[PDB]
C-alpha cells in the first residue's frame, strides 16, 4: 500500500474527475441499440446528436461519408486528450506521453516507409495519427535520407530509447517495417510496464494487468499470424513482450509452437485465455479470437475505473473511447453497405 489517496488529488484530482466525466459520456448499450436501427448516415447523425457527441458532425457536408465520421470522432478524441495533457503535471504528464508513444511508433513507421521509398515527408505528415504527431522540426525537411530521419528520431524524438533495440539506420533498410514496428512496440510496452510499476500503488496494481494482457495477446496473435510467412521462429521470439503472464516458458512454448492447436495448448494453461480461445470459434460467421481479445481488453479497461486514485483511468479512457470510435465507425459501415446482418458485432462498453 502506497496511500495514494493522501497525495494524488493534490496534483491529479481535477483531471481524475474530468476524465471520469468524459467516461460518463461513452455510449451505453442502449445508445448502441439506438444507433443500430438507423436507416441512413444522416439518421445516425441525428440519433447520435442526443449523446455526448452532440453536434460534432453537424458542420460537415451534406453527403456524409463514414471516412468523414471516423475523422471527426478521432478529432474529438484527440482534442479531449490534448486538453488533459495540457493540464497534466510531470508524473501524469509522463504517463500521458507514454500513451502517445504508441501512436508515435506507427507514425515513425509511416515516416521510415516513406523515406525508404523516397517520398517527401510533407506528404507523410498529414497521414500521421494526431495523438502521436511529431511536433519537433528536426523531423522535417529530411531530404528523403534514411540517415537523416534516423538521426532526427534519435536526437529529437522520445522513441530514441526504443530504437536502441535497433542499432543502425541500416536496420531500417534491412528489417521489414512490420518487424521494426513490433520491435519498437515491444520496447515501448516493456518500458511502459516498468514505468507503471515504478509509479507503484494503485496505478501499478490497476494498470499492470492491462499491459500484461497486451503482452499476452501480442504473443498469441503474433504467433498465430506468423505461420504463413517467412518470419522465422528465432526472430518471432524476439517480438514477444516479456511482461505478460506467459513470460517464462509460455513465450518459449509459443516460440516452439508451429500450429494453431499448439498455440491453443499454450493458452489452455491459463483460465483467462482458455476461455477466450474456447469462445473464439473463428469459423466463418462468428466471433474471431481478435473479437474475443477486444472484448477482454474492454473488460480490463472497464475494471480500471473501479480503482479511484490512479492514472490507469486515463489509459482506460483513451482505449475505451478508441473502441467506441471504432464501434461507431463499424455501425456506420454496416448502415452504408446495408450489411445489417452483422451490425451487432460492436463491442459494448459499459
Amino acid at each position: 500500500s502506497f496511500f495514494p489517496e493522501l497525495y494524488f488529488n493534490v496534483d491529479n484530482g481535477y483531471l481524475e474527475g474530468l476524465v471520469r466525466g468524459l467516461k460518463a459520456g461513452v455510449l451505453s448499450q442502449a445508445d448502441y441499440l439506438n444507433l443500430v436501427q438507423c436507416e441512413t448516415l444522416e439518421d445516425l447523425k441525428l440519433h447520435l446528436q442526443s449523446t455526448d457527441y452532440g453536434n460534432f458532425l453537424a458542420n460537415e457536408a451534406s453527403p456524409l461519408t463514414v471516412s468523414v465520421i471516423d475523422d471527426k470522432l478521432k478529432e474529438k478524441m484527440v482534442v479531449e486528450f490534448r486538453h488533459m495533457r495540457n493540464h497534466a503535471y510531470e508524473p501524469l504528464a509522463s504517463f500521458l506521453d507514454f500513451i502517445t508513444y504508441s501512436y508515435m511508433i506507427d507514425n515513425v513507421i509511416l515516416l521510415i516507409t516513406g523515406t525508404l521509398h523516397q517520398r517527401s515527408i510533407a506528404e507523410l505528415v498529414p497521414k500521421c495519427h494526431p495523438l502521436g504527431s511529431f511536433e519537433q522540426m528536426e523531423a522535417v525537411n529530411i531530404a528523403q535520407t534514411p540517415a537523416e530521419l534516423y538521426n532526427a528520431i534519435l536526437v529529437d524524438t522520445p522513441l530514441a530509447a526504443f530504437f536502441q533495440d535497433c542499432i543502425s539506420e541500416q536496420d531500417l533498410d534491412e528489417m521489414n517495417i512490420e518487424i521494426i514496428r513490433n520491435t519498437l512496440y515491444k520496447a515501448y510496452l516493456e518500458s511502459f510496464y516498468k514505468f507503471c510499476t515504478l509509479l507503484g500503488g494503485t496505478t501499478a496494481d490497476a494498470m499492470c494487468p492491462i499491459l500484461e494482457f497486451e503482452a499476452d495477446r501480442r504473443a498469441f496473435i503474433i504467433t498465430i499470424n506468423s505461420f504463413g510467412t517467412e518470419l522465422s521462429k528465432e526472430d518471432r521470439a524476439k517480438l514477444f513482450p516479456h511482461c505478460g503472464r506467459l513470460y517464462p516458458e509460455g513465450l518459449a512454448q509459443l516460440a516452439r509452437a508451429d500450429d494453431y492447436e499448439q498455440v491453443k495448448n499454450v493458452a489452455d494453461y491459463y483460465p483467462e485465455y482458455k476461455l477466450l480461445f474456447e469462445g473464439a470459434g473463428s469459423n466463418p460467421g462468428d466471433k474471431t479470437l481478435e473479437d474475443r481479445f477486444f472484448e477482454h481488453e474492454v473488460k480490463l479497461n472497464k475494471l480500471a475505473f473501479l480503482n479511484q486514485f490512479h492514472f490507469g483511468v486515463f489509459y482506460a479512457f483513451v482505449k475505451l473511447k478508441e473502441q467506441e470510435c471504432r464501434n461507431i465507425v463499424w455501425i456506420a459501415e454496416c448502415i452504408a453497405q446495408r450489411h445489417r446482418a452483422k451490425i451487432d458485432n460492436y463491442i459494448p462498453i459499459f
Binding site: E5, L6, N9, V10, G13, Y14, L15, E16, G17, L18, R20, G21, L22, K23, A24, G25, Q308
Partner: protein, 203 residues
Amino acid sequence: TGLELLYLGIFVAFWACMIVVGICYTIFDLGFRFDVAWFLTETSPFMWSNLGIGLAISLSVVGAAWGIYITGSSIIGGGVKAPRIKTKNLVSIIFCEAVAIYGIIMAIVISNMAEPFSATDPKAIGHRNYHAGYSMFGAGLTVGLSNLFCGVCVGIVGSGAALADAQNPSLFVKILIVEIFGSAIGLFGVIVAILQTSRVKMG
C-alpha cells in the same frame, strides 16, 4: 527518492544513535543519568499544556483542510461535466470543516484549564500541576490526531462520493453513510479529550 532519503537518513541515524547510547548508558552503569523522571518533571508543565492546545487546534485544521482539498478537487473536476455536483456534494466539505470546529472547541476548552503557578521546585509544583500539563498535552494529541485522521478519511470518502455522484445522481445519499461513519471518529476523539481533561486544575 530524494527528500525521503533525507527523512530516512535522519530517522535511521537518530535511532542508531539512540540504540548505541542506550546500550552505553546501561552497560557503563550510567543508567542513573538517564533520568526520564527529571526530564518529565523539570520540563515545565506549561510546555505540555500549550503544545496540547496548539496541536489540538492545528492538527484538526491540518485534517480539515486536507480533507477539504481532497474532496474539493473531485467536486470541481466532476462538476466540469456534471455541474449539479457543486451544490449537493458540499456536505463532504461541511463534514471536513466540522472537524476544525471540534478542534477550536477543544482548544478553547483546554486553554481554559491553564493557570499560573508561581512555583518552580517540582515538589512545590506538585502532582496536580504536572498531571494538568500532561493531561492537556494528551487531550491535545488525542483530539488533534483523531481529527486529522477523521478529516483525511472523510475527505477521501467525499471525493469518492462526488465522483460517484458525477455518474449517477441517486448514489450520493447512500455513500454519505460512509462519511458519517468516518466523521464519528472525530467525535470519539473529542470524548476522549474531554475525559482526559475531566479532572484537571492547574494552580
